[PDB]
Homo-oligomer: A and B are copies of this chain.
């Protein structure tokens, strides 16, 4: 499975940072879990393939493009001119969000979150995922850095060796010219003998 954790600011509580965790399998379009935490409580709702189709329809937007909009608002892919506002009432537990443009905002989704009974568990799992991902990446990055240095060396030595082989082969060019010069000189000797005989 996959996830994305984002920092958002809620309209009703812009004072502070809420964390949004969206997890799914293979594609967002086949449904996803969305979790919201303020570091003390957490709210979780699932969103089904049907509910995504339904919101795409209730909006007169093509399903593909709409899923794109969800990727940009809830995950990544958001260009820098993309601005979203996020709303969540801790009373009704309705979560909705909008895309701000050059004219007005238009809503993109309305999901129902349910307050979870053990927030601390959810928060702990989130943090463990961050630390695990960080440790794996650090390990892979140190290894890649070993691969870079080794390649840097392989390059220097291969170049050295290539230039020695080239310097060796290009000498046989000089040797060929010296041979041809000696053969020419010898030919002139031969002809000279025959012509000295012929001029008498």
Point out residues on A near B: beta carbons under 8 Å: 5, 7, 16-17, 19, 38-40, 119-124, 126-128, 130-131, 133-134, 137-138, 140-141, 144-145, 147-148, 151-152, 154-155, 158-159, 162, 165-166, 169-170, 172-173, 176-177, 179-180, 183-184, 187, 190-191, 194-195, 197-198
Contact = CB atoms under 8 A, between A and B. Distances in A.
A181 to B, nearest CB: 11
Given A39-B122, A172-B173, 19 more contacts: A40-B40, A123-B123, A126-B127, A127-B127, A127-B130, A130-B131, A134-B137, A137-B140, A141-B141, A144-B144, A148-B151, A151-B154, A151-B155, A162-B165, A165-B166, A169-B169, A176-B177, A176-B180, A180-B180
Secondary structure at the A interface, as helix, strand, loop or mixed, is: helix
Contacts of A187: 187, 190
Nearest to A144: B144
A120 B194 contact: no
A12 to B, nearest CB: 16
Contacts of A17: 124, 128
A182 to B, nearest CB: 11
A134 to B, nearest CB: 5
B38 A124 contact: yes
